[PDB]
Structures are given as structure tokens and as C-alpha cells.
Amino acid sequence: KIRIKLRGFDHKTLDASAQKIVEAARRSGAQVSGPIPLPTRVRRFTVIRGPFKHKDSREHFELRTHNRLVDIINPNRKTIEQLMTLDLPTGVEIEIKT
Amino acid sequence: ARKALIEKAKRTPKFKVRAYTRCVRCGRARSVYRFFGLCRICLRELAHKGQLPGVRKASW
């Protein structure tokens, strides 16, 4: 029962590589618990627009971290062998527990 | 600011309460968002140049 919390700053690149982690099978080998949504955490920064005065200007920036879960039950060893050099996203990260 | 006044470089500040921030890009000592290490003015510049990964115009 392996645990895989996925997270990055882009979500087009997440759901398209969490999908690539569910390449054991659609549902014929190990169970597969589907790519789990799991709420995103939004940091915000609010900057005064110009240098020097003009209090009332302001402009909003956000940086949002999206998080997935997946989780596979009953890990056959060839399912793990696929967790080797099989990736393409650069801005996606990978926590793994069991 | 004064190039001299980056004795923020002083790794030992004697007391940890003389430790302060400064923009790592411009020296600004006064809106240095600690996440980025950048001041408010540099942050908006870098945000707009797309050199702060993941950072985006935010509206809601």
C-alpha cells in the first residue's frame, strides 16, 4: 500500500504525469485509487504598484501549489520497476511513503 | 542603498537582533517579502519577467 503525494506549481503538468504514474493498468493489476484531487494552497503577495508613494495603487500576485494523491494498493515488483527512469515533467515533485 | 551598508553581509551580527533583511537584488531594506528575499519593487519586476516560477497575476 504505497503513498504518493504529488505537487507542483502547474496543474496541466500534474494531471498529465499523475496519469503517467497510473500506468500499472487502468484496473487489472493493482487496484489504483484514481488521481486524487486534494485542495491547492494559495500564497498571495500584494505589492504597491510604483516605487515611492501612491498608496492606493496595488497589484496582486499569487503562487498556487496543486496537490494530488493517487495511491496504489498491493505493489507487485514490476509495478515498482516502472517507477524508475519514466518521467518528463520538470516542475512536478514526488513524495513517496508506504 | 549605500554599498557600505551591506554589513548585512556581517555573518556574525554580534547580537541576533541586529540581523535584518535587504533585497538580495537591489538592497532595499523595507518590503522584503521573506519568501522571495526580494523587496516589493523587485518582486513585481521579476514577476512580470516570468522569472518567479509559478507566480502569476492574481484575480478573484
Add this chain to the structure above:
Amino acid sequence: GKGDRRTRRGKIWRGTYGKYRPRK
């Protein structure tokens, strides 16, 4: 109300707790 330190309303307004707004 909100100005008096030794009250419910007043302690709520100023973040704090104490004799007049027990933490629990």
C-alpha cells in the same frame, strides 16, 4: 465596551485572554 481591557468584548478586540476572557 471594546476599549475596556477587563471585559469579554474588550479582551476579544485586543487579541488576548486572561481573567476577564478565560482561554478555556
Add this chain to the structure above:
Amino acid sequence: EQYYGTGRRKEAVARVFLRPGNGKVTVNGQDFNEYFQGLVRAVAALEPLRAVDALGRFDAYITVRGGGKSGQIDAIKLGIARALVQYNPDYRAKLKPLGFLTRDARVVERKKYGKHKARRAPQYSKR
């Protein structure tokens, strides 16, 4: 076995379950009146059943999550009105013109910068 509608209102969600019964409504593991104790607006959550003659012909197990009790009232009201239409699609005639089917999309307006409060504008002098 029962009948169901959702109904949301201003950050609040009710889930309405309609049993056939005596008129006993229960809201969040509690009696209907024990939950809206002393809120005069309460009785208006059940204004669908009142205006399709159902006030006492249904029991109602309702779960309610989020917001504040007065919005929960409006949201239950939508919840009921919807269950009561998937139980008998003909009920719309004596239900739609009353408005009970519409969902109140009136929601808190965002806080704008340089304002105090979305629209409250800071006060100025000399002009």
C-alpha cells in the same frame, strides 16, 4: 425510499431528504426548532411544503454544512423545493412562479484595494 434535493445559498449547503411521514423535520442530528431556536425567519424554510400542501405529509432528514443559520434557512428552502420536484415533476406549476426553484446567487462582494471594504471608499478632504 426517500426524496432528495441539494439547495445552496451564499456559502451554505443544505442536503434535503424527504421521507413520507408526520411532518417531523430534523436538521443536523437535531430537531428543526431546536436548531433554529428563536430565529423568526425559520418558518420560511418550509414554505415549499406549505404551498404544495405537504407541511405534515413528509418527514425530513436534512444535513446542513457551512455559512450562517439564516442562509442555511434559505438553502434548506431550495433543498426542499427541489426534492419535492423530483418526487413529482408536475409540482413545478404551483412552485416555479413562487420562485422557490431559483437559487439565490447573491454572494458577498470581494474587498477592493484602496477601498475600505469593496465599495466603502476612504474619506477625503479639500475639494
Add this chain to the structure above:
Amino acid sequence: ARRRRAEVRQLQPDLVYGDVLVTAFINKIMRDGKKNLAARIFYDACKIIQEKTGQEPLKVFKQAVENVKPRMEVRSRRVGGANYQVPMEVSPRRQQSLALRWLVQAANQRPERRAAVRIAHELMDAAEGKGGAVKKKEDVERMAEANRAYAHYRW
């Protein structure tokens, strides 16, 4: 209203008299968004309208509103001179608002301590012909037919 004539909003009827006027009153009685204890007042006031009078409260509330509605009022006018107090008619929409507003205001002048009581007595006194609300109405109409000379600016 520079573009459209701007319509009136339709307050949902009372929960206890199923009436629109009673919501309106309750709304004028309410302050700071506390609608619960504005209704908690008007109704407490209604218990009092009976335990002091054989009459049903709705019939009395309605009765007193009518005694406060002003058939005439003045609103000032800038001319080719200055301020002329032109006696105008008063639309049925504006009589509504004026009556209700005047009723609450009058009520809150009173020396009775509970709010329901003040509303109660004002609501009663106004039905029976007297009371501060009516006085700032018999007054209002007195400024009309006194500036009657300026009726020929009817707008």
C-alpha cells in the same frame, strides 16, 4: 436615476401576518442589519397592541399608517430668484415611506424604556389620532396651504 426610472424592490411578505407593509415597518425598525430583533420587536409590540386593546394588531398598524400618510408636503425650489417652498402632491409610494419612517422616529422619541412598548404606544396613539408621528404630518401639510401662493410651480 439619470437613465432608467428605477423600480421598487419587492419585500417578501411577513412571516406572521403575511403582509408587505409589516416587512417594510420591520425593516425601518431594524438597525445595523439586526433583522432578527427588529421582528422580535414588532411582534412583541403586537402582543401589547392586544393586551391593551380589543383590536387585532394588523388592522391597527394599517389603521395608523393611514393617519400618518401626508397628502401634501413642500420641497424647496431654486428659481430665477432663490428658494421657493413649492407645495407638491405626495405620490402613494412616498406616503408609504414617509409614514413608516415617521412612525419609527416618533416611537423612538418616546420615554417608555422597552422598544416594543414605544412602537406599541406610537402605533396605538397614531391610530387614535394623536401622537408625535401625526404631529410631524399635520405639521408637514400645514406648510403646504401656507405657501399656497407658490402652488403655480407644480413641476
Add this chain to the structure above:
Amino acid sequence: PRSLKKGVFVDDHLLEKVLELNAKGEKRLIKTWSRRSTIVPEMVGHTIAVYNGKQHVPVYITENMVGHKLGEFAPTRTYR
């Protein structure tokens, strides 16, 4: 309503100096720049010169003013 807990504070370079002059006689005037330091009972006697950002001052030191901080006796600003 101030603040000296289970610590109590007196800046020490001035302290080792006054206790030193309590082996014999009292040095007329001591040049301090630390107004930071509370007064101990062992200071009652020798006149200490508290600074000012501008001038050391002849602060004679009575026993009626022990628990107080030094700078409480050398006014900073000048007024009318």
C-alpha cells in the same frame, strides 16, 4: 509597572568598575555611556556621570532612587 523578572539587569562594565571602587574610596565622577543599567544598592554614594547623546551629567546618587534605571536622571531633550 515595568520589567525585571527572574533576571534583573545592570550593564556590567560599569558594575565591575563601581564594586572595584568599593575596596576603598569613591571616585569623584565615572564616565558612562550606558544609561541602560539599573542602579544597585552598591552605587549609593559615588556620583556617576550618565551620558546624554551630548553630555555626561553629574548624577549624584541617593538611596531614595535605587530600583531606578540610570537614564531616568539624564534628560535627553531640551525644552523651553
Add this chain to the structure above:
Amino acid sequence: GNKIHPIGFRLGITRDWESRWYAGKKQYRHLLLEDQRIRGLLEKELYSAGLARVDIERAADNVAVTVHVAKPGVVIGRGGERIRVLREELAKLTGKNVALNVQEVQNPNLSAPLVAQRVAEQIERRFAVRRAIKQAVQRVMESGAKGAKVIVSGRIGGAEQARTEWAAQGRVPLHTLRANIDYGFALARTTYGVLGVKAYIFLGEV
């Protein structure tokens, strides 16, 4: 006042981030700083190649710098003895083992950063500004492009009173997101002040 960065505005869609990695709130600060140092050592030494942009990516400790230059000649050198020196000079500031790549720019007259960069250098070589700009635009319009626009700031010609010179043709539709408008800014350190060269280049739609 007016006019947001046409890049930072479109950053959502039609234009992606120069450096695209992920990092926690105890790392982001550091990676960002070093990321900058790289751009600095890069924008100074690679001037001759005329670098449009520098993509930087990170992962299992390693760093994939993907430099975009008009003339990859000047970044290679003795058949290598330059791309090695620079992948080396990066290994000192970045203790994390770098990987320098080089990207051809098919059409320097279709990358706003270079177009502007072009104009900048002329203004220092005392070219005629008005023409420079009308020309610069044409060179961009002749190379396909649905539209383009250039702007020189102030003190055109040593002129004591700072001005602004213009030029632009085709469509340059700033308020439409669905655009793709490469933007580029070049500085011009002249004898008598500084000048700013902004370059807009519209192309495509969806």
C-alpha cells in the same frame, strides 16, 4: 502610469515562465537567488551571441540551463573550448552541476528582445534614431509577423529635453490575451544619459 508588462499579463496563457521549477518555502528563496546569478553571468558574457532568453529548469539537484542565442557560433568557440569554459564557470556559482544547452534563433527579426537589443546598440553608435526605428520595424514586418511596434525613450540625439519616438505597423493588440506578443526591452547607455528601447512583436492568434 498605464500599461502592464505585456509578458507578465499573458504569463498565464500565451507565454510560459523563463525558469520553471518547483520549491518549498525554505528553498524557493535560495534557488531563485542562484538562478539570478546565472542570468547575470550569462547576459554579460553572451552579449555577442545576442541572447534572447535563458530557460532554467531544476530537479534531482541538477540544473538544465537552455540558452537561446541568434549565433550559437560564439557560444561554442574552438569547436567546444567555450561551451566548456562556460559550463565550467557556472559550476562554481552553482555547486549543483549544470547542463548548458544552446538554442538556435531562426529569425532574430521575430524575437522582440533581440530587435530592441539591435536598436539599443545603434543608438550608442550614434545612428539616426527615427530611421533606426522605422527600419527596425520593417525588418520585423518583412520577416512575416502579423504586426510590430518599437519605442525609444528620451534624449533622442543628445537633445536636452527628453522625448519619445515611435513607429509601428500591422496589428499590435495589447489588451487581447489570445495574442502572443513577444516583448523586449533594451537599455542604451549613451554619453549623455540612458535611453529605453521597448519592442513589441505580434504574431498568431489562438
Add this chain to the structure above:
Amino acid sequence: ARIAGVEIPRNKRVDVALTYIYGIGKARAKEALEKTGINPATRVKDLTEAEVVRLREYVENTWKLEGELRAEVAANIKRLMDIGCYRGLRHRRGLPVRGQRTRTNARTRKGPRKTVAGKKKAPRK
């Protein structure tokens, strides 16, 4: 009845009444009614003469109140006035002792406004 030196709080609840003495507020009232076991709620006139006594015998012998306090504080100030103290100066001038601003807003320490002429050659303000 006479609780503390020349004090006479009548006709309200006992706790509220006790505060009409100088050294006593809501907290010493509560306390000294708990520790003498008189129901705080009773009106003053309905206090047992025996009660009134166990009340006084606490309050008076346990706390510095009224007169013996008013000149403890007064003479407490003269202390910081008689040493070279800063708070003393502030007491002597009549200016916010606890480290406030005085550019504006120190009315409560300063008394009413002593308004003076402001300009000699500048607009209307």
C-alpha cells in the same frame, strides 16, 4: 452604612455599592463579599447589622483605602518628583508620564486647549 472611612454606599446591590469607596472596585467587591459570605445581590438597606460588621472588619483592616491611600499615591508621586527622575519632570510639567505622544492628543493630561496665533504670512489656515 459606614463601611470605610467616611464612606456610605446605600440602596444599590452590595457589590456595586462597595465600589463607592476609594480603594475599591468590581474586583475587591466580588472578593470581599465572597470572603465574608454576604450575598452580593442584596440591596444595601437589607444588610444585617451583623453582616455590615463582618464586611467592614475585612475591608478596613485588609486594604489601604480612602484617605490613607489618596496621600499614599500623592506622596508616592512626590517621591519620583524629589529624585532627579524623568517621570518626575513629566509629573511637574503636567505631561503624559507613561511615554505618549504630545504633538497632538495629550488633552487629558494638559487641560483644555491654550490656542495661540499660528501665522504671519501664509493662506487662511
Add this chain to the structure above:
RNA sequence: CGCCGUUAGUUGCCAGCGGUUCGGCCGGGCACUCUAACGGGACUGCCCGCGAAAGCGGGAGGAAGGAGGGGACGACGUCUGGUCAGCAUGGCCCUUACGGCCUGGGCGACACACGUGCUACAAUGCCCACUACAAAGCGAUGCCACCCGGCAACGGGGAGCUAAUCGCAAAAAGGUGGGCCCAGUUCGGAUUGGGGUCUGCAACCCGACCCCAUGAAGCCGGAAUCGCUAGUAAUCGCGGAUCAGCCAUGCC
């Protein structure tokens, strides 16, 4: 943001049965709520009337109907507008000081005046007790459950949480009960005397907080004057950034 669908089940449940140390705590399933990716949905498309047309008025169906609600987004130009103290940067200027380091002081000075605010002057109220419903956020040399000591700030001990799972966290107005009874009051919390806590090398100048006592002015404000057309104003609490701490009632 509002309605609906598909994908997705270490958050969600008298939906449906089993167990209960009556907590979705346990088996167990994802229907529902939600979470968040991708889609549908609106078009003056349909009907009636005016119109040459664009469109206008109205009416159905619909979660929503003519720009459904709110953001981001600001033209050629104007002001020789703001900013060389964020950053660049031409010129001019100083170069045992117009550079540099300290320690202390100042930026916090008070006879006065203005701006923006906060807290009020109370009964549609204030106090105490019990009890009910949020959203958005933040958390490692951090948030701190829980236990013990203290009236308390807080100290000692200690669990969990790299957090949809642990914590900040109590939401508050509201509701039920009790008290106050028209009073400068159980309104208002300014001032001042005392005793403490914590942060920091250090709180005199000049920190925040807790406790005791003190309990000012203020009974709704002249001339004038500001905001707001709907989840708006009004009102109530909550969070973050900055930051050891904090003068935040400011700001987002």
C-alpha cells in the same frame, strides 16, 4: 462567483444494512457534501407587440435573460505631474570627510492647528453564564492539543502535525438564562499610582501584554463636510503580509 455532467475516494454519511467504549469511532460503500481538473450551459435562440434595420417593451422555458454578479485589463495624449532615498543613469560636487566604524541620543520632542482613524456618549444597550452556525488563510529551529502551577499574562511538562489527516481556533454578533433600571450609571476606559509576565545584550528616553487601585472628557457634536444604488451601505467577528518583540485602531 451562480446551475448541471464526466474523471477522481486515508475529506465527506441516521444516504442503506452490521457493531458501538452512542465519537463516521469500527467494518464498510462514494451515492451526497466537498475537493479540483476537464466539459455542458446563454444565442435576443423561442413566442406576442412597436421597428426600414439595428434594437426596444413584454412573455415562456431555465440555476441564471439581454453586459447574470465581481475581478484582471486603461487609447493618441495631458500634467515639463511623482520619484536621481528602491534600482539604474548624463552632468556637477566631496575625497585624514559630504566616505567608514562604533557607543549614546534623535526620527517618539510640545503653547498650538489640520487630515485619516479608533473607542464612545448607552435599554434596538452593557455585564456574566450556557449554547449554535463561517470563509479565507498560516504553521519546523514553527503551530502548540493535553496535563500541572499561577487571579492572569505566562512558566514547567508534553501529544500530534513536513498538515483536506495536527494545531492556530474562540468565530462574533445570534439564540436561552440571569443581573443592571435613566444614573455620567454595572454607560465611556482616557489618565495616574502600584505589582507582575514575555521578547530581546538591552525596554529611562521609547515595547506589547496581565493583575489591583484610579475611573478623565464624553448625554450624539457650529460653520462646513465624506461614503454608499444590493449581499451595497450599516454592523459583527476571522486571517495574512512586515515581524524577536511591537506602539495594527493601519493595510491587503
